[PDB]
Each structure stands twice: as structure tokens, then as C-alpha cells.
Amino acid sequence: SRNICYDAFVSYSERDAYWVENLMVQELENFNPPFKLCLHKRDFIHGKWIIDNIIDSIEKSHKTVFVLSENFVKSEWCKYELDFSHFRLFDENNDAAILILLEPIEKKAIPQRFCKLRKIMNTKTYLEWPMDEAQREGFWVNLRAAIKS
């Protein structure tokens, strides 16, 4: 396109919206230099359809960031379990997604048909949002690193 690319497309839920739209934005969009983000629940076109918003954002951004939380799992995850004929390269070998664990998640409760997700949890690969405020600086450092990895 003209230059309408993005560093990351961030999918998350409305309940976690404050964190993403304040905390993450200040550490990324307001970083220096800054990152260009497509925020799932802030930049989606109203008229445009759902699947177009998703597929389109994903394709227009270098990476996809999932902000995992109990609520995000119940309310937004499924669409990401079962996917269909669009990534001619299969997301499984397409840079992989960046996962952020905003809060802990009782994987016992996590369905079981959520194969991808369960893996994720076990693989224990994700940037865990620290309870200790003294350790959040490092977190953002890791986040930016990952997005630009």
C-alpha cells in the first residue's frame, strides 16, 4: 500500500481496554521512535464487517499481539482456534504470534478443544504482566523487543 503498514495488530477485549489503550499505547505509540499499532477495539471500522476487520488488520501489520486474560479467553479466543484458508504459509510458520498474559488463567477451566491455547500456556511462552511494579519496565523492554524481533 501507500505506507499503511503496522508493527503490530493488537487483539484484546473491552474489559482489558484501559490497560491496552493507555499503558501499552504510552509505551509503544508514544515511544521514541514510536510503533504504529492497529488496536482491535479502537481502530476497527464500524460499517466494515467483522472478518474483514480482523483478516485485514492482521495482514496489514507485521505482527499480531494477543492480550490474554480470563475474559479474553472466554469472549475472544475461539475465532483464533479454528482458522481458515487465508495464510498460504500457515500462521504456524508465519513469525508466530506474540502472547501477553495480562493476568493468570486457570488452564484447568480452559476448554480442551482450545488446542492452540493450551499449548501456549504449557509452552509457557508469553510476556507475563508483572504484579511487582518494579518489574514492569523490563516487561515493556521485552515487549518492544518481541514486536521488532
Side-chain angles (χ1 to χ4, degrees), residues 11-129:
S11 186
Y12 60 98
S13 77
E14 300 179 60
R15 279 197 78 106
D16 308 312
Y18 178 96
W19 184 82
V20 174
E21 304 192 355
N22 282 261
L23 291 283
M24 195 192 291
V25 174
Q26 192 181 59
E27 292 289 342
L28 299 178
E29 293 198 309
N30 298 337
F31 186 62
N32 179 56
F35 295 63
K36 301 179 180 180
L37 312 167
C38 184
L39 304 195
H40 175 54
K41 302 202 176 316
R42 173 197 72 183
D43 310 326
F44 269 5
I45 300 303
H46 186 211
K48 199 175 184 180
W49 284 56
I50 171 177
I51 90 176
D52 297 311
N53 276 324
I54 289 182
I55 285 63
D56 278 303
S57 285
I58 293 185
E59 308 189 317
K60 298 180 180 180
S61 47
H62 287 298
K63 282 172 185 168
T64 298
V65 177
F66 297 103
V67 180
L68 313 172
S69 67
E70 301 280 34
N71 21 314
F72 177 76
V73 175
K74 310 184 73 298
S75 85
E76 315 278 335
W77 187 251
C78 167
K79 320 125 58 179
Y80 296 106
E81 262 308 320
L82 10 123
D83 166 293
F84 183 58
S85 78
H86 284 157
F87 309 74
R88 298 181 180 180
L89 301 176
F90 293 62
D91 288 299
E92 61 183 61
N93 62 64
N94 301 178
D95 267 354
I98 296 186
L99 298 166
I100 297 180
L101 190 61
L102 196 50
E103 58 170 355
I105 294 177
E106 173 63 88
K107 61 183 178 186
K108 294 182 180 181
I110 289 181
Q112 194 70 62
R113 293 212 178 82
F114 279 172
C115 311
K116 296 181 181 297
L117 195 61
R118 274 181 172 289
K119 185 179 64 179
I120 301 308
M121 309 312 290
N122 298 312
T123 307
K124 245 170 183 173
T125 39
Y126 48 60
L127 310 198
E128 179 179 1
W129 172 245

